[PDB]
C-alpha cells in the first residue's frame, strides 16, 4: 500500500494542469503562426500532436515537435548505427540548410531557433524566456511562468511517410503482445527525424511509443470504463520517478534520462503480455519485477532499442561501467530498504 | 460426429480459385473507374472503397464492389421516423457540383442518379469485348448494378453507387454500435469518426450503409488483440458466421417461402451475439457446436419476437412486421428447428 500512496501525489489532477494547458496551447499556437507567415524556410511546420503534450510523471514539463513533411529524401545511415542517418534530396526552399549534398541539422536547428528567439521576445503577456542551448537537447526550450514555472520543449522534426528503414525491420516486437494488425498498422504510419558531426539526424518514434502507452493492454477494453485496470502505467511512473529522484541527488548519474525506463518497461511489457500479469492487486510484484529487469539490463549492460534492436542504449561506448554500477547500487538500496526517497 | 468442421472444410474459398478470379474482377473495376473519372461525367471523383475483402463470405461466386462519391455540402433528412432511410438535400444552393443534375426539386434522386450510373456502366460493358461480360437484369431490391462474368467460371460483381459523408453519423445511430464491453471505447470512438455512407433505395430515399465498419468488426472480432492471429488464439466466431449463412442460403435455394431473408440478417444476429458472448473463451474451436447451436436458438428467438434490430440504427427493427410476415418467420422457424433437431440434412 506504501507504492500506492506515492501514486497519490504524482497522479495529475485536471485542474491544476489545465491552466498550464491553456498556457501552453495558446503559445505554441502563437508560434505555429509565425513559422507559416512571411519569408521562413518552415513554411509547412505542422505540430505533430492536451495530455499527450506532458511529461508523464514530470508536471508543468511538456513536450511538443513542429514536424516538417518531406517526401523528396534519400536516407543513408550513418556508419552502421541503425538510429543516425545523414538526409540527402534525389530532385528546394531547404537549400540554404543544405552543405555540399547533405542536409545540415545544425544549419536549420540554428535557424530555427532565431525564429523562436525573435517571438519569445516579441510576446510581453506571459513572460517567457528561451533556455540555454543545453549539449544534449535538440529542442528550443521555453520558460513560462504562470507564476508556475513551466518548460515546454519545441522539437524540430522532419516527417517521412515512407518506409521505416531496415534498421527497425526486428522492431517493435508486439506480435505476441499488442498483435501483428496493430503492429502493421502502426509501421505503415510515418516516421520522423530529430536533429542530434552536425549533420546527422536520429530516428524518432514519439508517435507510436504515445500509442503503445495509450493501447498497453492485450485485450481492447484494458483500462477502460467496462474493462479491467491494470497497474502498467502505475509502474512506469514509479520507474521513472525513482530514476528521477536519483538523478536530483547524484550527479554520477547524468548518463541516464527518462528514455532507458520507458524502453525497458516496453520489452517488460513484451515479455508479460497478458493483462493478469499486471493486476493492480499485485501492483508491489510487479514494480519489483520490473526492477529486476531493469538491474538485469544495467548488469549486462544490454537494453535494445524497442524500435532499432541493432542500437544497445546501455553499450559500454555510451554508458560507462561505473555508472551503471552506481544506478545498480542504488536501487538495490532501495529496493530493499522500501523505498525511503519517495519521501 | 464432427459434421460441422466437415461442412466447414467444403466451404473453405480454395486460394488458387480466388485468386484468378480476383485477378480479372480487380481489372474489370479498374477499367470502370477509368471511365468514370473521365470528362462529360457526374461521376467525375468516384472512388473504390476497399482484392480478398470484395469477395462475399459464403459465396465465392459473388463479388462487392463499392463507388463512393463524396459529398461534404450535403444535408439529411429522416424519411418517416425511419431511421436508416433519408433524403439528401444541399446545405445552400449548389453551384460547383455536377451532382445537381439529378436533382428532383431540392432532394437528390437516387432513381435519377442510379439510372445515369448504370448507363455509364452498360455502355461500357458492352465495350469490352476481349472478357465477355454482361450487366444483368433489373431487380428490385438491389440498387447496385450486378456484372455477369463468365471466367469460364460464372462469377457477379455487384458495383454498389454510394455517396460518402465525412460528417458526424446521424442521431439514429448514437446508442448504435454497442461493442463498449466489447471491442472497447476506444475502438467505437475511432470507428464513429469514420465516414458513412448512403445507398440508393418515394424513389429519392438513400438507405444508411457501414459496409466499412462491419468490415472491420469481422476483421477484428476478438476482446484480445492477438484473437485469430498467429502468435493468438484461435477462435470460432468466423466459422459460425459462415456455417450459419451456408445454412440460410441452402433453405432460400430450397424454398420460395424465404425471400424475404437474406444474409444481412444472420449478420447482424451474430454481431449481437458477439456483443452477448463478448469473451473469446466463449467461442472456443472446441465448442464448435455449442457455439453454433447458441447462435441458432438466438436466430430463433429472433424470429419468435419478431425483433432483430438494426445494429447500428436500434430503432430499426429488421424482423418488423410490416417488413417480413409472420407465416415467413414461422416457416423459417420450424426449417431451422428442423436441422438443428436432425444434425442439419441440407448440409449434404
Ligand atoms: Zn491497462
Ligand atoms: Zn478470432
Redesign the interface.
Same mark, same amino acid.
Given at each position: 500500500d506504501k507504492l500506492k500512496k506515492v501514486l497519490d501525489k504524482l497522479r495529475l489532477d485536471p485542474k491544476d494542469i489545465s491552466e498550464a494547458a491553456e498556457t501552453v496551447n495558446k503559445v505554441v499556437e502563437r508560434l505555429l503562426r509565425r513559422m507559416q507567415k512571411r519569408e521562413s524556410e518552415f513554411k509547412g511546420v505542422e505540430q505533430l500532436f492536451i495530455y499527450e503534450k506532458v511529461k508523464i510523471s514530470a508536471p508543468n514539463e511538456f513536450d511538443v515537435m513542429f514536424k516538417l513533411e518531406v517526401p523528396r529524401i534519400e536516407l543513408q545511415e550513418y556508419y552502421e548505427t541503425g538510429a543516425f542517418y545523414l538526409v540527402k534530396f534525389k530532385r528546394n526552399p531547404l537549400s540554404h540548410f543544405l552543405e555540399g549534398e547533405v542536409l545540415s541539422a545544425t544549419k536549420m536547428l540554428s535557424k530555427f531557433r532565431k525564429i523562436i528567439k525573435e517571438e519569445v521576445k516579441e510576446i510581453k503577456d506571459i513572460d517567457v524566456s528561451v533556455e540555454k542551448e543545453k549539449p544534449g537537447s535538440p529542442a528550443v526550450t521555453l520558460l513560462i511562468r504562470n507564476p508556475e514555472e513551466i518548460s515546454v520543449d519545441i522539437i524540430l522534426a522532419l516527417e517521412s511517410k515512407g518506409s521505416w528503414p531496415i534498421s527497425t525491420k526486428e522492431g517493435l516486437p508486439i506480435? @505476441?503482445?499488442? @498483435? $501483428? +494488425?496493430?503492429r502493421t498498422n502502426l509501421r505503415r504510419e510515418p516516421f520522423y527525424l530529430v536533429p542530434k558531426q552536425g549533420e546527422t539526424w536520429r530516428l524518432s518514434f514519439s508517435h507510436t511509443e504515445k500509442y503503445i502507452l %495509450? %493501447?498497453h493492454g492485450?485485450? +481492447? $477494453?484494458c483500462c477502460? /470504463? /467496462? @474493462?479491467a485496470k491494470c497497474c502498467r502505467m502505475e509502474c512506469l511512473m514509479l520507474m521513472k520517478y525513482l530514476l528521477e529522484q536519483l538523478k536530483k541527488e547524484f550527479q554520477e548519474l547524468d548518463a541516464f534520462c527518462s528514455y532507458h525506463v520507458k524502453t525497458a518497461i516496453f520489452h517488460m511489457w513484451t515479455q508479460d503480455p497478458q493483462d493478469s500479469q499486471w493486476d493492480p492487486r499485485n501492483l508491489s510484484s510487479c514494480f519489483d519485477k520490473l526492477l529486476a529487469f531493469f538491474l538485469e539490463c544495467l548488469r549486462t549492460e544490454k537494453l535494445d532499442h524497442y524500435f532499432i534492436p541493432k542500437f544497445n542504449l546501455f553499450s559500454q561506448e555510451l554508458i560507462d561501467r561505473k555508472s551503471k554500477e552506481f544506478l545498480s547500487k542504488k536501487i538495490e538500496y532501495e529496493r530493499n530498504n522500501g523505498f525511503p526517497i519517495f519521501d
Open positions: 506480435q @505476441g503482445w499488442l @498483435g $501483428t +494488425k496493430v %495509450n %493501447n492485450i485485450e +481492447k $477494453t477502460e /470504463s /467496462s @474493462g
